[PDB]
Amino acid sequence: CPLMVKVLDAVRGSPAINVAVHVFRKAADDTWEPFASGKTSESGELHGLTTEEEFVEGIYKVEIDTKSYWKALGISPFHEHAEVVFTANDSGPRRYTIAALLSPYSYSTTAVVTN
Amino acid sequence: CPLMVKVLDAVRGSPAINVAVHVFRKAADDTWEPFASGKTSESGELHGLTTEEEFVEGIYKVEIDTKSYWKALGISPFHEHAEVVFTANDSGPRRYTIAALLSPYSYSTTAVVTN
Amino acid sequence: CPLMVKVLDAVRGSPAINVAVHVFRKAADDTWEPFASGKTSESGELHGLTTEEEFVEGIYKVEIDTKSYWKALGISPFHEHAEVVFTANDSGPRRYTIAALLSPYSYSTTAVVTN
Amino acid sequence: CPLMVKVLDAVRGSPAINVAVHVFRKAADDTWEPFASGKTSESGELHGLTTEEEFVEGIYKVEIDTKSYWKALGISPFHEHAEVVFTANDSGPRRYTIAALLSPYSYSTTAVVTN
Numbered sequence: 001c002p003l004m005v006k007v008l009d010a011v012r013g014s015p016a017i018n019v020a021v022h023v024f025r026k027a028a029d030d031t032w033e034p035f036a037s038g039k040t041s042e043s044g045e046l047h048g049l050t051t052e053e054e055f056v057e058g059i060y061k062v063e064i065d066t067k068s069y070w071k072a073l074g075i076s077p078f079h080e081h082a083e084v085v086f087t088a089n090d091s092g093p094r095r096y097t098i099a100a101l102l103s104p105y106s107y108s109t110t111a112v113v114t115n
Numbered sequence: 116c117p118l119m120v121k122v123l124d125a126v127r128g129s130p131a132i133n134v135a136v137h138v139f140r141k142a143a144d145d146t147w148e149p150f151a152s153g154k155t156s157e158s159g160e161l162h163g164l165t166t167e168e169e170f171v172e173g174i175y176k177v178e179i180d181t182k183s184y185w186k187a188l189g190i191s192p193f194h195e196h197a198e199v200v201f202t203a204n205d206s207g208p209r210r211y212t213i214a215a216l217l218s219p220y221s222y223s224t225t226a227v228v229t230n
Numbered sequence: 231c232p233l234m235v236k237v238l239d240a241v242r243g244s245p246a247i248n249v250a251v252h253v254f255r256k257a258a259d260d261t262w263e264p265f266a267s268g269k270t271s272e273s274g275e276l277h278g279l280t281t282e283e284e285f286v287e288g289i290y291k292v293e294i295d296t297k298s299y300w301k302a303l304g305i306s307p308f309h310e311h312a313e314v315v316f317t318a319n320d321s322g323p324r325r326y327t328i329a330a331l332l333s334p335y336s337y338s339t340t341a342v343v344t345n
Numbered sequence: 346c347p348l349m350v351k352v353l354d355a356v357r358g359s360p361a362i363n364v365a366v367h368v369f370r371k372a373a374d375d376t377w378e379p380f381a382s383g384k385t386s387e388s389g390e391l392h393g394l395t396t397e398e399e400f401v402e403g404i405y406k407v408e409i410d411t412k413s414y415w416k417a418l419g420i421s422p423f424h425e426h427a428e429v430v431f432t433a434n435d436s437g438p439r440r441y442t443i444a445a446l447l448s449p450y451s452y453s454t455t456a457v458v459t460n
C-alpha cells in the first residue's frame with residue numbers, strides 16, 4: 001500500500017516474475033533489520049509489503065535478487081543483486097513505488113512517489 | 116487497450132503528467148501517417164489510443180513531446196522529443212506498453228509486451 | 231570531435247561494436263538531410279563524424295541501428311532503431327557525446343555536452 | 346586500471362564531478378571491509394582505486410555517494426547512494442568499468458567488463 005515494488009525485464013520485454021525482494025530498515029545500531037519480503041507476481045509487482053502504521057520514517061533498503069533471476073533464465077549476470085536505499089519522509093507523497101528495469105549487466109531504478 | 120504509454124519523471128519522482136504523445140504508422144510510401152494521439156493522465160498513462168481492430172501489423176512510431184514538458188517546468192532539456200519505433204507483430208504478446216523515464220538530458224524506454 | 235557516439239551492450243557488458251549510425255540535419259524545407267554516418271569501433275565509439283566547421287547550428291537526428299545489431303547476435307529485438315533528436319550549437323559551438331545503452335527490449339540514451 | 350568508475354549527471358548533461366566513491370570487499374567473516382575510495386574528476390571518472398595485484402577474486406561493493414552530490418546542487422534526492430555489488434575476477438583477472446547515470450529520483454548503472 002505505502003510501498004510497492006515493480007520489476008521489469010529488458011531482455012524479454014516483460015514483467016520480471018517470481019523475483020525475490022527483501023526490504024530492510026536501518027536500526028539504531030546502524031544494522032539492516034529485516035522488514036518485509038516477497039516475490040514479484042505475474043505482473044512484476046509486489047504489493048502488501050507493509051502498512052501505513054508500520055512504515056514510519058526511517059532509512060529503508062530494498063534488495064532485488066537479480067542474480068537468481070538471470071541464472072534461472074540461463075543468462076550470466078553481473079550484479080549480485082540490485083539495492084535501493086532511501087529515506088522515507090512524512091512530508092512527501094504518501095505512496096512509494098520502487099521500479100527497477102533489469103538487464104544482465106545493467107539495472108535502472110526510479111522512485112514514483114505520489115499523494 | 117493493445118497499446119498503452121506510460122511516462123515517468125526522474126527529476127520529480129512522479130508520473131509525467133500532461134505530456135503530449137503522437138503515434139504514427141508507416142505508410143506504403145515510407146512516410147509517417149498520424150495514427151493516434153493524446154496527453155498523459157495524472158498517472159502518467161495514456162490509454163485508449165487504438166483498438167485491436169485498427170492496430171494491425173506494421174511499423175509504428177511513438178513520439179513523446181519531452182521538450183515541451185521540461186520547458187513547462189523551467190528546465191532546459193536536450194532532446195526535441197523521445198521517439199520509439201517498433202514493428203507490431205501478431206505472433207507476440209497481445210498488449211504493448213511503451214514506458215519512458217525522462218530526465219532533462221537523458222531518457223530510457225522499454226517495451227512490456229504481455230499476453 | 232564535436233560529435234561523438236558511444237554505444238554499450240547491457241546484455242554482454244561490453245561495447246557495442248560495429249553498430250551503424252546515421253546522422254541527419256533538418257533542412258530549410260523541414261526534411262531530414264543526410265549529414266554523416268559511420269560504425270562504432272571495438273571500443274563502442276564513433277569519432278570523426280563531422281568537424282567544427284561543418285557542424286553548424288541546427289536540429290540533428292542521430293539514428294543508431296540497434297535492430298541490425300541485435301539480429302546479428304541472434305536476438306529479435308523490439309525497436310527498429312534508437313533515435314536521438316536535438317538542437318545543436320544554438321548557443322555557439324559545443325562538443326556533444328551521445329551515449330546509448332542497449333538491451334533487446336529497451337534502450338537508454340544520455341548526452342554529455344561540454345564547452 | 347582494473348577498476349574504474351564513471352558517473353554522469355542526467356539533469357545537466359555533464360560528468361558528475363567530485364562524487365565520493367567507496368569500495369568494499371566481502372571478508373571471510375561476511376562483513377564489508379573497506380577496500381578503496383576516491384572522488385570523481387572533472388571528467389566524471391575515478392581511476393587508480395586499486396591494482397591488478399590487490400584486486401583479487403571476491404565480492405565487491407561500489408558505493409557512489411549520490412545524495413551528497415545532489416544536496417550540494419540544491420536538490421533533495423530520493424536515494425542515499427547508489428550501490429553496485431558484484432563478484433570480480435572469479436574467471437581470472439578482468440578490467441571493470443562501473444558507469445552510473447544520475448537523476449534526483451533515479452539512477453542507472455552498467456558494467457563494461459573486458460579481458
Ligand SMILES: O=C(O)c1cc(/N=N/c2ccc([N+](=O)[O-])cc2)cc(I)c1O
Pocket residue numbers: 006008097099100101108109110112121123212214215216223224225227336337338453
Ligand atoms: O508502476 C510504475 O511505476 C511503472 C514504472 C515503469 N517504468 N520503470 C522504469 C522504466 C525504464 C527504466 N529505464 O530504462 O532506465 C527504469 C525504470 C514501467 C511500468 I509498465 C510501470 O507500471
Ligand SMILES: O=C(O)c1cc(/N=N/c2ccc([N+](=O)[O-])cc2)cc(I)c1O
Pocket residue numbers: 106107108221222223236238327329330331338339340342351353442444445446453454455457
Ligand atoms: O566509459 C564508459 O563505459 C561510458 C559509459 C556511459 N554510459 N553509462 C550508462 C549510460 C546509460 C545508462 N542508462 O540510462 O541505462 C546507464 C549507464 C557513457 C560514457 I560518455 C562512457 O564513456
